[PDB]
Amino acid sequence: PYKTKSDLPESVKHVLPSHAQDIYKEAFNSAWDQYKDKEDRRDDASREETAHKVAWAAVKHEYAKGDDDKWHKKS
């Protein structure tokens, strides 16, 4: 679902600083490619979804969400 970074979700890009999108995307894609379990399933959304969960995990690792709805690089 992501190709470079800007492809990320608005709710993501509208909260993620900069390298967080790469982290997000790179983490998402990682979980996407890793999602070889639900590759031949009609529920591909689950994959994309899980990737979202994963990517965020990376984001929540290198980035933190302030007391509003925005994030900033932690590590």
State the amino acid at position 57 in one-letter form.
A
Candidates 37, 63, 65, 64; CA nearest to 51 is 37
The CATH classification of domain 1-75, taken from the options 1.10.1740.70, 3.30.1360.150, 1.10.10.10, 3.30.1180.10: 1.10.1740.70
Identify how the structure was determined. NMR
Cα radius of gyration rounded to whole Å, the chain? 12
Two tokens, residue 42? 């009609």
DSSP string, 36-69: -SSSSSS-HHHHHHHHHHHHHHHHHHHEEE-SSS
Candidates 6, 3, 34; CA nearest to 18 is 6
Please give the angle made by the CA atoms of 23, 71 and 50, to the nearest 5 degrees: 50
- Region of 52 on the Ramachandran plot (φ > 0 left; ψ -120 to 50 alpha; else beta): alpha
Output b/e per residue, 40-55; b: 16+ Cβ within 10 A: eeeeeeebbebbbebb
